[PDB]
Amino acid sequence: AKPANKLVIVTEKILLKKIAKIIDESGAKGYTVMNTGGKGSRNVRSSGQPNTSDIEANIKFEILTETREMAEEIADRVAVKYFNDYAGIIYICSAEVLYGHTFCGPEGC
Amino acid sequence: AKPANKLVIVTEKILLKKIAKIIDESGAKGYTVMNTGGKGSRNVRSSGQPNTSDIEANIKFEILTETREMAEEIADRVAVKYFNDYAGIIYICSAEVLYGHTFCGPEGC
Amino acid sequence: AKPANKLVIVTEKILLKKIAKIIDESGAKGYTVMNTGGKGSRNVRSSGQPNTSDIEANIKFEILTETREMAEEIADRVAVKYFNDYAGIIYICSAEVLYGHTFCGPEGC
Amino acid sequence: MDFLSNFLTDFVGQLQSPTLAFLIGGMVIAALGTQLVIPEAISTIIVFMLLTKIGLTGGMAIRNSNLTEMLLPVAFSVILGILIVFIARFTLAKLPNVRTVDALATGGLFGAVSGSTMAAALTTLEESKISYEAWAGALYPFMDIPALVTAIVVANIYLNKRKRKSARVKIWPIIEESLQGPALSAMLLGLALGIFTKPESVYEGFYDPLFRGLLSILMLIMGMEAWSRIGELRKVAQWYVVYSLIAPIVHGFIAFGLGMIAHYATGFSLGGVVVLAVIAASSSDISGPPTLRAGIPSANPSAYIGSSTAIGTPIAIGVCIPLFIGLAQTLGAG
Amino acid sequence: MDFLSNFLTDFVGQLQSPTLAFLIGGMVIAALGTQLVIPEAISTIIVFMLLTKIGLTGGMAIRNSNLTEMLLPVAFSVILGILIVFIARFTLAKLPNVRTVDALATGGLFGAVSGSTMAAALTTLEESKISYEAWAGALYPFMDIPALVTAIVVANIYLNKRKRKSARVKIWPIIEESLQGPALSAMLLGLALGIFTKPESVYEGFYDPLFRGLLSILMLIMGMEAWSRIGELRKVAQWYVVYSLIAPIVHGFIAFGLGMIAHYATGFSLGGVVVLAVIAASSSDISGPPTLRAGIPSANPSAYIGSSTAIGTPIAIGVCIPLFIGLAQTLGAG
Amino acid sequence: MDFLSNFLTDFVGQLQSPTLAFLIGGMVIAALGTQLVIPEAISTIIVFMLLTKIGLTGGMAIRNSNLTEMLLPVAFSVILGILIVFIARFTLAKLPNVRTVDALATGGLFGAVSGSTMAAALTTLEESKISYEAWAGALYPFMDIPALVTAIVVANIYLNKRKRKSARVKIWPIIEESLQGPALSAMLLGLALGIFTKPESVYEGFYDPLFRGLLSILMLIMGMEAWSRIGELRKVAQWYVVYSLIAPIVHGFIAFGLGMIAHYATGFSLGGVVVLAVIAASSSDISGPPTLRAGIPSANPSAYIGSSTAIGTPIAIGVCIPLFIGLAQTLGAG
Ligand SMILES: Nc1ncnc2c1ncn2[C@@H]1O[C@H](COP(=O)(O)O)[C@@H](O)[C@H]1O
Ligand SMILES: Nc1ncnc2c1ncn2[C@@H]1O[C@H](COP(=O)(O)O)[C@@H](O)[C@H]1O
Ligand SMILES: Nc1ncnc2c1ncn2[C@@H]1O[C@H](COP(=O)(O)O)[C@@H](O)[C@H]1O
Ligand code: NA
Ligand code: NA
Ligand code: NA
């Protein structure tokens, strides 16, 4: 049970490739993204398809980082670069990674 | 990193607008809903469309509240009103909101 | 608020029925699965449908167990059986289940 | 007399036809496994654009016709839809182990009308060359809306006098929520575009050619959606299997003869009587169980969904559409 | 002179036709609620395979024709698409409470073209028996790409001299991101398959028959997508309602006469002039607002999306397609 | 002798036709970016209702025909599907840097067939006016099921004697899981509805008209799904590029002549020999993958998916469908 930090970024859908570049360049081992819907008083959501078929219009990243200082390095290069003009929220939870290869190493957790 | 509480409500799909009224009236800054599937020994799920195309038949709210007493105010007006006849589960996790405007304020977190 | 443990399994999509057998046999009260997308340096994802329409190609279980020793019993019968040949990551978070019937009991939480 | 003769040779010819062949073909494969699934995006655009065709062919033949003829069949369906839920309140609910809240919700769905069992009749009426009345497709909202609203009111007037008297329903947001739902606002759009505009270049060319084809995809879904609930009414008592197997036969006989008053009073089509029967015998299972779950939350959803999907809709199409075509083909012209 | 005569009897005949009847039919039901929704998987294969037809019918009639005739209309659209955003920079932006960054983004969307307002014109041109030029569908990428790129450059050359001088745009990844997007790579595929291959067995049989039918499903989406943003331009100032209601009329007049230089210089179709007008008078709202949100992030999305969806596209189809068909039917042959 | 003459003028006419033009048209746009995507709900109802047509046209011409003629071609495919995986076990696996577990899984997919590569042959056989046998579409089950099951058994009988002897497969749940999967239970439904019922009013009108049209949408997906795996077999050794480029040519020659025993023994169609060759020269890439990953989990999915999608299916359609039509058009009638 290697202790980790679950960074969660919940932003607009059109930032799918752009924040995934920030995650890959920061040195995180990977991410998990899913399509969500929400309500946050900045609700416009261009998104590419028409509005009435936008049952889900946000995306939710979940990045498990080994150290706290990497999770606030990812979260800072997003909120400076995109959240002054786009929607979003970022929060850190705690987690203990039990299994996995790129996060434990060959020795295990 | 303003400390918050992630309220999670996992209920049937047909309560999408009804619980979103309870969240908006309680004074929460917003929610995040997504379509999930599950198994809980109360599995019927009318849902509007036919049954065989119900790969996902639940919905999962995630409400970040500033105080614990608001998250149990949202969770109480749902379980009294709907969970005596509908399916559902509610749980609180802990989180530290890093960025966001409606949750931090103009001063930041 | 009965204290629980949120076991999260994020694996390939083709293990939907196979890990759901492991969850049902272990004595957990239920699970919550959703379709996600990701990136983890083991990215192939056969998945049954063609590749270009694989916006989401992973699945994400969330199992709330009453005790820690059940959550590591579920997580061990998956990583031994499937993660030597398939993709995946498992982690435990903490949660306090407020409401629900199969998890609280008739006396409540 | 000549009715068992022109049923048994009509039940076979129904079973050869693809509007029933894919229904029992869909139950057979779903009984054998079949990870085949028709996705939700395809099933939505097939329930739409099948009811838009029913709306457009009803709206075109309602503007060039005197709408005095409509007065008897649209009043004989409002009466009949309220009548079905009271039949279930005095016949189904009076069995030893059955709840009144469930029996009102089971009879609430059989009063209503599904577009699957309905569009299966509109093809079979013009496959056996019986000239039906074209606006009879617009008779769908009547005996769909008064049947679901007289199951929510009656279940609350039962449930009030059990805890207030023994141990209030806002009548408009029930019927302005079922009206602007899908599969009904698809047809009301199709009506208003037929009365007012002239969509004859898109009806013959898109909505009429692939109507009988998309119906067969939709009948395949309803067969698979019937086997998925066949293990659900083995959770409630055995009288629901008896009700859902006999009530399509009973509700259509007191729809046929109650609609035989028409074309004796005002000129009605006699191929519209069998359309008015198959709509009375059919039971809702897509637009129905969203309501009677927000309206009647204390009911058992395994009791009313499991009766109108598993046994209600295959019997309303298998042994009920040829039961009333042949009876209309015997009693008069076909 | 004869133009108000052949507008008012042409506006009614437009409004009876299903390419506008489902648009106002889609706004009426969406104003009344309607949990009817056309899913995203159906809306994608309808925007594809409607622009593949426009591509295939443009690519077939571009290989057997001398492509000297194309030189004036594909240059009169590059000039015109750059012209629209400068009109909004010197007319719309010079109002009391309006930002320059928003007014360049509103004029950026009107400069572009939308395949919904375009394919509605290609049916109505051959419904009123006006022989239009078949490669005019391939004029879509011009006055879509130079209009969006001259709204991002001009908004940055405004926003640079506000913080650098008062208190750099890479020109290629703007136009190689809008080019290989959906609804444009669907048509460029349709062009190259018409120039090089012979898809005449799949064009007549799949892409041509259900073109006018799928257009009606697509016009229904655009009506519902117009009512969903009608409450969004009540958040910005009242001059956007004036701009989006007059600029389809103004931008098409200086497209018609600017395209009347053709068939006086090189032989052009005169049913292609009205196609070149409806493409100039229509504003983009599906492929557009992905750009001008990654390109101009400091703009208000409620100001430019709410003007080109709610008021831009219904007026470009309601009062602008019959405005230029009749004007082309008066001035010359029809 | 006359075979290079009637290939090179047949390879061009194949490449002009939309059943190959959209395949290379789909690889060209996907090589250039293109955020165009055909969604999963559309791709499912196109693989269904293309194999339902193949099932219905096979089931109709199997009830009015003596089924003695079927005995040789349905036995020459069971033999051949087992034969392909042993060819890969003694040719592909015996290279310097290649694993036996991967080479059995690559030959396991080439053994199996692909509805996309088979639907492309059934149109091209009746585009060049060659009367093929109609039940040859019902030959999809054979040489799909014995080829995938003799790659899982043989890979386990290799992997047992590596750790048990050097350092048990339940034969039924392999073939009752591939049988009731999608794209095969779509066709077995289409067979049983053709043998038993009479769906001739829905076949000619829905399943036959938009067959060649939906095939072109499906060939566009397979081109984009070929470029998405072209960077995946640059992760495994270079002998997979040699295998996947030659084995469609080799496996069809020992399918043609092995099927030339038919119409010398029992009366076979000779346009069914070329159907039996393409069904033998094609790979899985959609149904094959799900299996041989639950059955052979220790294999490299980049080695067998990257060979049957990227190089297997474009060569089986580009240089293999005209290779065997012309060889059947030379050797006999066409
Ligand atoms: N307090 C909150 N709890 C959960 N999700 C939120 C909260 N505030 C904002 N969000 C989500 O953050 C995204 C952007 O919201 P905003 O930027 O506040 O408009 C949307 O997906 C919201 O649902
Ligand atoms: N122990 C649990 N862990 C995770 N999800 C659960 C659990 N129990 C119930 N659920 C979810 O709660 C919803 C309702 O279940 P129930 O009300 O118990 O039938 C379904 O989406 C279940 O998947
Ligand atoms: N550090 C991480 N954070 C979040 N998700 C991850 C992480 N590592 C792997 N995953 C997810 O785990 C699944 C399998 O990745 P892998 O097995 O590492 O290829 C994919 O869905 C990834 O997105
Ligand atoms: Na009824
Ligand atoms: Na324009
Ligand atoms: Na093969």
Residue numbers in the entry:
A (entry chain E), B (entry chain F), C (entry chain D): 2 to 110
D (entry chain C), E (entry chain B), F (entry chain A): 1 to 167, 208 to 374
What's in the article?
SbtA, which is ubiquitous in cyanobacteria, is an inducible high-affinity sodium-dependent HCO3– symporter within the TC.2.A.83 family of Na+/solute symporters. The sbtB gene from the sbtA–sbtB operon encodes a PII-like signaling protein that senses the intracellular level of the secondary messenger cAMP that correlates with high Ci conditions, versus AMP at low Ci conditions, thus functioning as a Ci sensor in cyanobacteria. The tightly packed trimeric structure of SbtA is exclusively stabilized by the gate domains at the center, with a threefold axis perpendicular to the membrane plane. In summary, this study provides structural insights into the cyanobacterial high-affinity HCO3– transporter SbtA, which exhibits a new architecture of Na+/solute symporters and its fine interaction pattern with a PII-like protein SbtB.
To elucidate the fine interaction mode between SbtA and SbtB, we purified the SbtA–SbtB complex in the presence of AMP and solved its 3.15 Å cryo-EM structure. The SbtB trimer is associated with the intracellular face of the SbtA trimer, sharing an overlapped threefold axis. Similar to the previously reported PII and PII-like structures, SbtB also adopts a trimeric structure, each subunit of which shows a canonical PII ferredoxin-like fold with a well-structured T-loop. In addition, an AMP molecule binds to the nucleotide-binding cleft between each pair of neighboring SbtB subunits. In the complex, the core structure of SbtB does not directly interact with the intracellular surface of SbtA. Instead, the structured T-loop of SbtB, which extends ~20 Å from the core structure of SbtB, is inserted into the inter-domain cleft of the corresponding SbtA subunit, yielding an interface area of ~740 Å2. Similar to the complex structure of AmtB–GlnK, in which the T-loop of PII protein GlnK inserts deeply into the cytoplasmic pore exit of the ammonia channel AmtB11, the SbtA–SbtB structure showed that SbtB T-loop partially blocks the substrate tunnel exit of SbtA, indicating that SbtB might attenuate the transport activity of SbtA under certain physiological conditions. At the peripheral side of TM crossover within the center of SbtA core domain in the SbtA–SbtB complex, there is a clear cryo-EM density most likely corresponding to a sodium ion, given SbtA is a Na+-dependent transporter. In each subunit, the Na+ forms five coordinate bonds with the main-chain oxygens of residues Phe110, Gly111, and Ala112 from TM4a and Ala320 and Ser322 from TM9a. As a result, the two domains of SbtA in SbtB-bound form are relatively separated from each other, yielding an inward-open conformation.
